[PDB]
Assembly symmetry: D3
């Protein structure tokens, strides 16, 4: 039965992330837009086929769900949980709707964003807008290849899409976003070897460091989680650089999709609160989260009504 | 011959415009950067050949010129002249240095901008930063094809590059920038036929309206100027959309290059002050200028040799 | 179990449509060719992989089916039904075989057509041959984007392929073709807003007109059908422009695939005969059908086993 | 003086349009000629840099005299019919030529539509061919077509009128012939026999060596040296065309040269033969059904009307 | 399914074939590498996505299987069988591990091969290393299109992947490799028509010769085998040219995958030993095999978990 | 101009370098081939236009020049001069003819090489054959971007092509080749920072190290040469990786073109013999030259008229 949104997108080099809150009285305007967003996606993107690769994934937060709909809630939907670690904090910030807009070119992203916000004028308040761009060798702002170990094909379907465990919402997914700002001057004072020790992979060749040399507090060490049976727990990420040279903002916009938020939240706890072997993820010594929100991205059929 | 900077670039779909002023004491840091900016362009761009098409054109304002260099000045170099029209105004805003960075993708522009501003930290103050993107059919924010009548090839070299009239600065050019914000709601209330009358060309097919029907106050009518020579006076433009949907900013970043500022300045007078037959350019009823600066972009050799 | 033909093709920018009748005595030659047409598609196409995207969909008409095969007929196969509306007429023209050839380039289409017709000469008579091309950004000759609301992925498979309702023929599809010629002079005398009222979508941006404003005799209004159960009835279309400038022929070659012809036929009745609120589809005031035929496109394994 | 785009990049699509000028049509035509470059930019600019749309406009001998007064190009005359013992090169009407080329047919067709829209009621179509590149620069006989064309400066020198006719410098002369091929007869030859007709190898496009290339091969007869020992060259941009239902398989020949004498010498050798060769063997499988000669002026000549 | 390795790869235009033997003591080094080969594939390939199309298929020979693993063997796994025909011989040459590395560019192949062999240094001995390149119309060194009749889609999965007949090893496949060197001077002395009679297809157009003219000793005739049920038995091939102009080596590296080696072995017997109708495959009069090995390529899960 | 060979090629991602010696008696065969090498470039290349970008540059050695040609010699032609440094040695190896073949794909290079060697069979002896491939981000085998500071456009024409200083040979160039093998084990034992000190540029970003930190014995410091005039002396390099993973050969094939050999030879003396402040180029601590030859690459017209 259920047609998912375009959560599993091809590689795209541009993105717009748009996070808004729904104002008092705005619920009907929002409901109308949600039922049309797929046809807007086609209107803007069809004529730019096949290279445009335009898609929009729409997500709805826990409090907004209760304002918009009655009846069943997705089983895993709750507000993003703040993490107050000994050193680093993951903040929770307001957000009722997410539009994750991706394409091969920024203009297509912007054209679709314009149409969406045009219909929502007067009903919502912008909280965050980020124009992301991938570097040409899939590198992020820290200079490392970003995306390598994402699951693909059936492994990805199994990791990201709600199934039989919550059958009313099958084909949906849960998205966590965080906007990170980096301290680039501190980062660039590390040697490459030191940087590799923070991430857990070689910088130029993107080969994973072996088990015997990878630090316990490296990013890859802490975000590798096995579940009860010893299989790996996976998420699908599509992190995007963004910034402004004039204001000295250099950032990574983190977005992670998973079939239940528990996987993403466990990775976050390991990063921010630590383990027995690690105080915290070393990447956080160069990266500060300034937003944090959780959304449910329903199956596309759910929005079509 | 001297080597010009990459004023005549291929079509590029992304740009960063950076305008800065030079702080007290900043001149030495700036001069060092100017002499390396071509090698930064190659360092960032060479590994992304041949698709990247990264280039950087560096321009220097009138006041800055005198702080940085002694000796001759380019003949046409002066501060941007405000035009206070009956209805519309072309404002002047501060700017000592211009970096016009272009490529096929934004990331390359950003990488080069990062390196340039890294070398200038503590010597300059940012005045403007715009990340521009072209729409997929060469359209601008108003929905019209933008660039069609630009000169190409030898006609472009002749229109844009200083020559024997100022031989110490041959291979340079003059750049005018203005950031425009549009009233999209007003524009979208016009019919297509009305919009065509404001521009002077057909929207869908980009065919110029004939002389017998194009209004005197259309954009194309007012920006067509013939010189005393009988010849058309031409500039080279590379206008770029930009914006922010959350702030409702929809804009066109205008940049026009010419061998002398007099050509560009004449067009601006016609648009803002009008003619015998036209109050002002109708495009300005949907577009407000919020910056305005003039720069000289020297030949590449001039910068290398510092 | 069954392998369909390439009804669900990627976007392709060239097509040849070939419609022939089977002469008396030609049946054996045709049956031989049918069993080899997949081989020929590989012979011509393989060397241009992966970019060529060459495919041939072969369709058989109602009367030809009875000449070629005995045993079961697909449940929905009949001759195209002529529609005699008060103003506009959908003609039925002869056609026994359809070859719908698509690729990313016309040379591949032509090469495969040449091989097919080479085997069939002496057994068939050509009735229609159209060379189609993609026009800009998926536009048709009326200047509108064409294909936007086609179904994709799973919804496409369900709308187009025969399943358990006719299990001997599962994996087949029904194709309806009509060649349309446009009155471009009349069309271009409309304003863009009036054209948008004929189609039901915005011209430049391809955004559907809202329920508030979309006329009931617009093309989009009349070709939207909900079935008894409230769900939409969808077809898959791959309309191609064609023309000749010196003859003033500007055309749309319509082809629509569906799992039963009744969906397509309902859409046709609405367009030509009208509804309570709409006399006929306004697009027909600028479009004349000069061919009309219906074919069954069997699963690929049906053709291989002859 | 700026030439028209006679020297085009390689393009995979073309439209050739040949028309006659009706009585009274001269003024409409002159107005169009002064706008044709503008139309080329309007249709082509939005598809840059890939589109490579160009239009070369040519004027026949009788038409020149109806449109213009004063001095005429030195070599401009009606195509000369050649009545050989076996094969004939016919002359057919044509006052104006539009040779429209691009990387896609749609651009060609859009420009042709605009041109003919302006000429409606002043001209009568004589010939319209939509050409396509066939595979790896092959023609309808299955041989690579284009290999020995001149390039760069050698091409400029072979095709552009210069100091020998200074009032018309930057112009060129175009000869067109539409050929139909008897493919059934051609395909009855072995590959080795076909190679003997053309003078090059079929699969590899290597020229046959001088000791085995026949005197009546196409390459032998179209190789001409001038009195000073240099090669006389033309620039060709032959295009396949056809209709499978009518069994029409064709080559649209177009040859540009700085004087029609070069092209005409080649044609005489092909149709009328030499001491050692009755005629070009390619003509035993190829019938000319059109023949016209045009002068393609410098671009400034057309702008200034 | 279990997840197979990338046996069914898109068309790729470069390859490296690496065949090694495992030295005494090398077993544990090899086992460690096998369990990381998929992650090396992603490390080298990810940053060149989506155009890179880098994949590595790893296979294990019969004798090596017994050294490396205890427990079940794949049912079809045995050493390549030498064929000593009346005229032509298929030699068997040593090989424990196969790395079949494919991409759209040689450098990706080479980078992955470097990482693999860097981990194996001192545990293995290289027996064969071939750098292959496709000619631009999918042609091989004899000038014929190579790969036309390969199965695709479901037919390919059914032909190449082990299923319920050996359920512990489902998702695996069997690969046979042979390096062939060609006598190009002799081949070029045949007419095209004679060459077509050797292969069984037309050279220029790649159309199969009809049954009435195709010789019984042509390559296509002898490699067509039907199974008990009258269905064709198919393999998947990805033959690659290679060579050295200075040494006058012009070669075809044959690799054929099948769900059981019996299919491939039948074809080889027909080619080298002949049949009642055919002395041997005429292609062997212009081609000499200088290597021959058989490998099992396990499902990707099998490699991960050990 | 006279017409030069394609010394200034676009970026190409494949190359074959072929060096041969002329056997005695072979001179007539070679002169015949030289006069046809341009037509063979077109025969192989034209059908792959415009993407193939196949070119062949043909170079002749000092001693071969004397055997092949009647009259005057290019002024700078002599045998490669061996350099016997205190630690490292640049060897001179035999080479009469160089074919420097480049394209976007290796098959086109191989096809042209095959045709050339076909005509030379029996008259020449191969000395070296290298199949080169570029890494995906213009990197060399040491992991550094390679080519960044090459001259471009007019500056390239002036650095590379013989002009009025030797007017009978205007439009020619001089090529130096050296095949280098690297000690990758040693190199990979250095930290990135230490590697950056050997080369003189940053590894990841390719930014040149600043003057106050760049070592005197870095590659970039030693290969930067100013002439008498204050101006920089430039060469045009097209270095290609090559190798074989089984034999542990990881190589850079150096080729440098210049309008006089003096530029290239100065750079070589600085690398191998050192300066006041540098013993030798640190890159040579990880790179061994195993060939070395010098050739004159005539204008295209010179070769055509033989
Ligand atoms: C306000 C934002 C601006 C927009 C959106 C805009 C847009 C356009 C458009 C759509 C065209 C027609 C197609 C073309 O040839 O590019 C055009 C032409 C032109 N514009 Fe603008 N323009 C702007 C500002 C300016 C300014 C400030 C100047 C001069 C100072 C200028 C000078 C020209 C010129 C010279 C032409 C070509 C006229 C000719 O046809 O010969 N534009 N512009
Ligand atoms: C009948 C249709 C024609 C066909 C199919 C055709 C085809 C070919 C082919 C395959 C070649 C060899 C490859 C190449 O260099 O382009 C060639 C060469 C040539 N053709 Fe034609 N051709 C035709 C008519 C003509 C005509 C009418 C002329 C001259 C009036 C002509 C002049 C040439 C010239 C000059 C060459 C190059 C000869 C050289 O190597 O120097 N062709 N043609
Ligand atoms: C010198 C080695 C070889 C060359 C150059 C070669 C070349 C070709 C060519 C040109 C074709 C026809 C087009 C196609 O369908 O790919 C073909 C088909 C085929 N080859 Fe080979 N081949 C070689 C060795 C082998 C070997 C050793 C086998 C089997 C063990 C084999 C099995 C096949 C099969 C199964 C076909 C398809 C037959 C069909 O039409 O059903 N090939 N080969
Ligand atoms: C092992 C052999 C070689 C390797 C791996 C190598 C590598 C490099 C690298 C990585 C660069 C910096 C990037 C660039 O501008 O291209 C470079 C620059 C350069 N190399 Fe080499 N190179 C080699 C041999 C040579 C030789 C033998 C010469 C001269 C005869 C040479 C001359 C140069 C020059 C002139 C530059 C540019 C310096 C400048 O003006 O910045 N190289 N080389
Ligand atoms: Mg016939
Ligand atoms: Mg024998
Ligand atoms: O991540
Ligand atoms: O503009
Ligand atoms: O030709
Ligand atoms: O094969």
């Amino acid at each position: 039965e259920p047609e998912p949104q375009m959560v599993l997108s091809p590689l795209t080099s541009a993105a717009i992330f748009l996070v808004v809150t729904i104002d008092s009285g705005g619920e009907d305007t929002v409901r109308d837009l949600l039922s049309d967003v797929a046809s807007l996606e086609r209107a803007v993107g069809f004529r730019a086929q096949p290279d445009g690769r335009l898609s929009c994934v729409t997500g709805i937060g826990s409090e907004a769900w209760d304002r918009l709909f009655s009846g069943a809630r997705p089983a895993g939907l709750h507000p993003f949980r703040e993490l107050d670690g000994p050193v680093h904090r993951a903040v929770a910030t307001p957000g009722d709707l997410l539009f994750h807009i991706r394409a091969s070119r920024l203009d297509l992203c912007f054209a679709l964003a314009t149409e969406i916000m045009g219909r929502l004028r007067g009903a919502v308040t912008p909280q965050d807008e980020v124009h992301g761009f991938k570097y040409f060798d899939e590198r992020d702002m820290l200079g490392f290849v970003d995306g390598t170990e994402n699951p693909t094909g059936a492994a990805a379907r199994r990791a990201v899409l709600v199934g039989a465990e919550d059958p009313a919402f099958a084909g949906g997914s849960y998205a966590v976003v965080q906007k990170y700002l980096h301290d680039i001057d501190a980062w660039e004072g590390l040697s490459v070897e030191a940087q590799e020790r923070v991430i857990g992979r070689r910088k130029m060749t993107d080969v994973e460091l072996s088990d015997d040399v990878k630090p316990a507090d490296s990013h890859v060490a802490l975000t590798s989680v096995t579940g009860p049976d010893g299989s790996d727990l996976e998420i699908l990420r599509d992190n995007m650089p963004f910034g402004s040279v004039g204001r000295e903002e250099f950032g990574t916009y983190f977005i992670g999709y998973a079939r239940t938020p528990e996987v993403t939240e466990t990775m976050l706890e390991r990063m921010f609160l630590g383990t027995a072997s690690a105080p915290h993820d070393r990447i956080l010594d160069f990266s500060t989260a300034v937003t944090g929100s959780l959304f449910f991205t329903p199956a596309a059929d759910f929005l079509e009504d």
